[PDB]
Amino acid sequence: PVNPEKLLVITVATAETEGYLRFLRSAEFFNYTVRTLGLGEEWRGGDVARTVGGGQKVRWLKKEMEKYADREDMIIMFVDSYDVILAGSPTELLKKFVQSGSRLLFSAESFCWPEWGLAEQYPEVGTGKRFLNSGGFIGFATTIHQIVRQWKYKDDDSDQLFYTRLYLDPGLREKLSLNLDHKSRIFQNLNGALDEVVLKFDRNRVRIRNVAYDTLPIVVHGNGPTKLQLNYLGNYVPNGWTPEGGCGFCNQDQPPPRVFLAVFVEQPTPFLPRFLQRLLLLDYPPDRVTLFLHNNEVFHEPHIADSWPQLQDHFSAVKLVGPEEALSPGEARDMAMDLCRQDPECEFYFSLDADAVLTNLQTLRILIEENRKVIAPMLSRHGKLWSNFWGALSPDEYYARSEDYVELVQRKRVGVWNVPYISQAYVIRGDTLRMELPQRDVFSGSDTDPDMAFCKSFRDKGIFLHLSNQHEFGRLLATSRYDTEHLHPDLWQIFDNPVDWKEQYIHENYSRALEGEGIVEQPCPDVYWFPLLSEQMCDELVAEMEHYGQWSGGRHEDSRLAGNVPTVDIHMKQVGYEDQWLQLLRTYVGPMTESLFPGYHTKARAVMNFVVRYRPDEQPSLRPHHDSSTFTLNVALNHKGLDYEGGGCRFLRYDCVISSPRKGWALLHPGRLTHYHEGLPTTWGTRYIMVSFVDP
Amino acid sequence: PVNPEKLLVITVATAETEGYLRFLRSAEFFNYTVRTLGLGEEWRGGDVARTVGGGQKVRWLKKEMEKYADREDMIIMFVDSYDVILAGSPTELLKKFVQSGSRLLFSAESFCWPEWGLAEQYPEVGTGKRFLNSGGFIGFATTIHQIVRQWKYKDDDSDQLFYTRLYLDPGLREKLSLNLDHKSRIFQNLNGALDEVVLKFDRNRVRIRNVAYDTLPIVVHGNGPTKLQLNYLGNYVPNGWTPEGGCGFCNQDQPPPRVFLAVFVEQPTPFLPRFLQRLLLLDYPPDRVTLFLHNNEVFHEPHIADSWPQLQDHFSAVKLVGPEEALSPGEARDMAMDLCRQDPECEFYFSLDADAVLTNLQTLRILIEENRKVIAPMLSRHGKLWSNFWGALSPDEYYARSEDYVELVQRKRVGVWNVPYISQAYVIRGDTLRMELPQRDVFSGSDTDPDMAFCKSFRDKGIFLHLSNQHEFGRLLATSRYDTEHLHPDLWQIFDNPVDWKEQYIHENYSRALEGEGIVEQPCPDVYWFPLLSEQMCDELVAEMEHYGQWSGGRHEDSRLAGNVPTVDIHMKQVGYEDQWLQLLRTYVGPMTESLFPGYHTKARAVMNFVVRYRPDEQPSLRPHHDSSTFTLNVALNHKGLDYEGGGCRFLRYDCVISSPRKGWALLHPGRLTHYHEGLPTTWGTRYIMVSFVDP
Ligand SMILES: O=c1ccn([C@@H]2O[C@H](COP(=O)(O)OP(=O)(O)O[C@H]3O[C@H](CO)[C@@H](O)[C@H](O)[C@H]3O)[C@@H](O)[C@H]2O)c(=O)[nH]1
Ligand SMILES: O=c1ccn([C@@H]2O[C@H](COP(=O)(O)OP(=O)(O)O[C@H]3O[C@H](CO)[C@@H](O)[C@H](O)[C@H]3O)[C@@H](O)[C@H]2O)c(=O)[nH]1
Ligand SMILES: *[C@@H]1O[C@H](CO)[C@@H](O)[C@H](O)[C@H]1NC(C)=O
Ligand SMILES: *[C@@H]1O[C@H](CO)[C@@H](O)[C@H](O)[C@H]1NC(C)=O
Ligand SMILES: O=C(O)CCC(=O)C(=O)O
Ligand SMILES: O=C(O)CCC(=O)C(=O)O
Ligand SMILES: [Fe+2]
Ligand SMILES: [Fe+2]
Ligand SMILES: [Fe+2]
Ligand SMILES: [Fe+2]
Ligand SMILES: [Mn+2]
Ligand SMILES: [Mn+2]
């Protein structure tokens, strides 16, 4: 049994990057003792993500090893730090090192590099990896000193080639007992072996298993183009997310910092007035928030103009960049982000897109408390898997589904996740914009999509893109085929955005009245009365009818039964709102009717759907008649007294009169046999009603 | 101006027949002074309806004229009496006689008889009648004596030939100034001139007009085969029936005579039990009535058997002649009539057929008060023109429509009418059967129809067949295609006899409840409750269902809506009663529904009509459901407590229960949306209901 007190882990890090801190946390989880070489210094090893190099690591190790030149009692493991996480304990590590029978065990990998021609010099191995990788090795301090002290090359020379050439010396390999971890018993390099690595879960920790060799590696090395795969594994291994503990680093539980809030409207997006009004409700001191709003659509200029006085009176400062600036989305996002970068008072930058609905008013706070450089709240299309983040990339950096993507979207696993792509909503530390991403062309510069260029700019600097589903934050609006050719296009959004359509157009008490609690009334026998449409729905529907303007006249025929009984009206089929109103009937009127008439079942068929107009100059009344319907829906659309004077509906066989109709409320009565009824004359103004003969 | 006191009318009559009395009344109406020759004597003039004769008239006239042989101051008119009516006053008569310039004016007619060869000897007349008729002449008493005193022939010789030969003497015609009433200014002979004679009406008298000559004759002579045409005219001329006075001889306003009442059932006839029960209700002392009933149908033997104890206990005496006697209708009617003839105690004979419905219970009295030899009450098919009498005959003695037939049937003209044919109901004086029609073969003897032989037997004896529409007497049942292949065939008589079908099967309060007066109830909201079917209708409908016996079982489907909801039942289409029940719905349920639900209009369409059976061993209940109907008719068919124990119908949304249904009563409720309802379990016995899903 080798004493873990004799094991020392040595790594190299020229800065306390997020990858290096992720490495330290994994090492501290297993009580490793780690010595970091070169924290204050400048990396002279060259662009290691582009070419070969890393010789500066050997120079610092060689210098460090001189004081351990005679320490046969010490075992030393050298690993990278930016793309390495530890998955096993020092006891299991030293046990496996002794089992190898080696005095200096390098990591093995599938590829022979930098020089391919050296592959013939390598010993033959059956099913295991054959070639050396210098990203991780472990051995006696004396044996390691005898290897690293031969370093005498440039900082930007290849350390992999240096260790490879020494290993391929047949005499030296035999003398010092050099070996390679062929079956990944200790070191797991990810490049060329992604299909061999899977997550092995435990109650309060997560490891990886090599299914090719049935091993549980100690060191996980995301060498080469496997940085994103290591980011994925790093969200779990070793204590990132556990089945019984949840996240292992997230929160899960004085003036606040000043924030630049940037709003982007880059396409015609539904319910923008609701979004602009929602900005006033975000739970963050508005005296600490500066508002930037770029609107690329002339369709939204009136929406922005109506809300701008309230916004300017609310926030510390406001600035609108309208469509007349001819700014591309990438130029506008570069401009807003740079306004925060070039302002030392901007402590955090909050970028919120117009299709992002923030149901959680505490979103800005929660993200700032997470204390990340870049963090995004998880927002999803309602009922769908589409969301504001990607779990994986294709090699061409297009979308790909990750193994745990559906678990994250469905919030089977909650926490703060390191993901390759975020969009639509993210909070970025101001210091990071100045110290690490100082360039202007973050979203622009290339023919790639501005959102992809943004994420790729931070990945190229090793900046993690975090995503939190720790709380419910909101949803994403559908903006795909938003038909703008309407006086009020949001009336037609019942299919694409039903949740927001209900909150805007369905009466705020429809739900409460549907569960009971004594809101629905029965003013006349078997004539029920419930709130259905909001006042905004009534005003926009009436306005949409008058904008059409072609009301009924003579010769018009309706499905009424008396003794022809027409009305001056506009059918939904004429204005193209039939499919929309039939959806309202199925979703909202159908279930209400079955609750008020127990035993009846409805699919809400209705061929007759129309808005009637009553006026003293036109048709002020509607003589007694029946309806070609099982039951009739009768919704008022304006106010009595304010908009019109005159009676409503009278049911003759009961001597009962609905004299004072309520605007958004709807009447529900049988249409045949029993409820012979008549519309009382409108004596002043104009009376609008919406009526459907459902189940004919 | 010739004094009417100098005018004497002379006629011949060997008996005071109805024709002779009709002649006297017309003569007394104009204050004629009439002397009748030969009242007590026997007619030796031969069969004058078959051959030639009448010479006995001249012998009696010649003898009578000898005392007026020198009376130049006297004008004398000789006419027949049996087939003659007077239409003008003696003043107009004498004025026209003087205008003729004749001393002896014979009647003229179209035919030259008995000898045709004498036509050449007659003077030529342009447009008027050319030949002599001895049925009527008028002239001076001296001139008439010089003609009739030359009589020296047999009693059965032709008087027409006697007067013809004297007129055709050119010297004698000139000497005595003999003439013929060519243009019918005084005498109107009907034979050969029926198309020339029309009725001319006044306020309180009726005449005839000869449209060929534009004359108003004084004497109407129904010579030859025109006796029935004179009977027709005799009902009006001169004071028979007038537009302002009505009938001129009918009534229009102590133990009663003993009556033999003969009932004839010669075909399967509907509602015979109702007829037999109606015999007990005729308003005539039953101790004075003897009942004879001939039944030719074995189908009616049970009907006769059920009523026979009550009939025998009611009348003075009863006698049934059943189908086992193998009697033809003519033999049975001969037998019953002869039973009265051969009984001196039979004062009147009342023959009533089974298809005669006597609504007027005072029919036997009213007819006896009319004091006629033979009189029939007018009975008609309901709403039709077919009735129990004929107004005219074809030459082959088949039916023909008379000029006033429709006026009589529609009772535009009411009175007592002399008609050529009666049937189905008539009262015959017993004395007439003994003294004038003593033969047995009244209805039998020839291949002619027994009803026609009956009427022809009385016409051959000069007996008038009278018909009274002075009152409403009743109607005639349709017996044409009476389908007897049913357990209760009268259930299917709703089309052919709707008036009697309603009185037997429709509840006795349906009408009263339909006019209001607070019979209909509303036990549950919009569930009405009215009496519809009588108890006999319910018992016969239930019995007809069980006689079919093939009730529903598994796999049966109904037009009910819940959450399949079947019932053990029998649809009307299965038993062939659909068309019948649909007629009940149109006539009786439709109008009731429109009265109880003002504004609704119904044609009573119903594809689902069925009788449900509830039993504890079978299907005792009917779970909650709706109906494929606008409204549902629910009629009980038996008694609760007596026939079954268990609840009825429960309407869930109202917490209202029809716990105690009434047998013949029907429920009327909506079938959709509001009246989710359930049939409570029948715990004992059997519960029958009739249900229609009307207006689906
Ligand atoms: O600015 C830097 C860059 C790198 N490192 C360190 O150098 C190591 C190597 O960088 P890495 O991102 O892990 O590159 P790799 O994808 O692992 O590929 C490597 O492959 C060889 C063997 O691992 C290395 O010597 C080369 O630096 C490099 O090309 C990092 O982990 C860090 O520990 C720094 O301390 N600072
Ligand atoms: O049993 C009788 C039959 C006849 N008459 C009288 O004779 C008259 C002639 O009888 P009728 O029925 O009128 O015969 P018609 O159809 O008029 O035809 C007649 O035509 C000749 C001229 O009128 C008559 O002499 C014949 O009797 C007769 O054939 C009657 O009106 C009676 O006045 C009797 O008094 N008793
Ligand atoms: C690490 O050491 C601390 C004491 O320094 C001890 O409490 C803890 O249990 C150790 N954890 C592991 C995983 O060895
Ligand atoms: C008939 O005579 C009576 C008196 O004898 C007279 O009252 C009546 O008016 C007369 N009628 C006619 C029609 O001449
Ligand atoms: O005017 C009303 O309130 C009734 C209108 C109605 O029922 C209809 O539109 O058919
Ligand atoms: O059993 C009852 O009273 C109800 C029966 C009924 O409504 C039906 O026949 O559908
Ligand atoms: Fe309309
Ligand atoms: Fe209506
Ligand atoms: Fe059925
Ligand atoms: Fe029912
Ligand atoms: Mn590395
Ligand atoms: Mn005659």
Residue numbers in the entry:
A (entry chain A), B (entry chain A): 33 to 285, 293 to 602, 606 to 738
What does the paper say about this structure?
Multifunctional collagen lysyl hydroxylases (LHs/PLODs) possess both Fe2+-dependent lysyl hydroxylase (LH) and Mn2+-dependent glucosyltransferase activities. LH3/PLOD3 is thought to be capable of performing two chemically distinct collagen glycosyltransferase reactions using the same catalytic site: an inverting beta-1,O-galactosylation of hydroxylysines (Gal-T) and a retaining alpha-1,2-glucosylation of galactosyl hydroxylysines (Glc-T). In this work, we have combined indirect luminescence-based assays with direct mass spectrometry-based assays and molecular structure studies to demonstrate that LH3/PLOD3 only has Glc-T activity and that GLT25D1 only has Gal-T activity. The LH3/PLOD3 N-terminal GT domain shares its fold with Mn2+-dependent GT-A glycosyltransferases, encompassing a UDP-donor substrate binding cavity stretched towards a catalytic pocket.
Aiming to further elucidate the significance of the differences caused by this specific residue in LH1/PLOD1 and LH3/PLOD3, we generated a LH3/PLOD3 p.(Asp190Ser) variant to mimic LH1/PLOD1 at that specific site. MS and luminescence data showed that this single-point mutation completely abolishes the LH3/PLOD3 Glc-T activity without affecting the ability of this mutant to bind UDP-Glc donor substrates. We also solved the 2.30-Å crystal structure of the full-length human LH3/PLOD3 p.(Asp190Ser) mutant in complex with Mn2+ and UDP-Glc. Overall, the structure appeared nearly identical to wild-type LH3/PLOD3. Analysis of the electron density at the GT catalytic site showed clear signals for the Glc moiety of the UDP-Glc donor substrate. This feature was never observed when using wild-type LH3/PLOD3, further supporting the importance of the Poly-Asp loop for Glc-T activity. The side chains of Asp191, Lys89, and Ser166, as well as the main chain carbonyl of Thr83, were found at distances and orientations possibly compatible with electrostatic contacts with the Glc moiety of the donor substrate, resulting in the trapping of the sugar in a portion of the catalytic cavity, leaving a large pocket shaped by residues Glu141, Phe143, Asn165, Asn223, and Asn255 available to likely host the Gal moiety of the acceptor substrate for catalysis. LH3/PLOD3 p.(Asp190Ser), matching the corresponding residue in LH1/PLOD1, resulted in strongly diminished Glc-T activity and yielded a crystal structure with observable electron density for the donor sugar moiety for the first time, enabling the identification of the amino acid residues directly involved in Glc binding and those shaping the portion of the cavity likely hosting the Gal moiety of the acceptor substrate. Whilst co-crystal structures with donor substrate consistently display no density for the sugar moiety because of uncoupled enzymatic hydrolysis or very low occupancy for a very flexible moiety, the inhibitors show density for the glycan part connected to UDP because hydrolysis is not taking place.
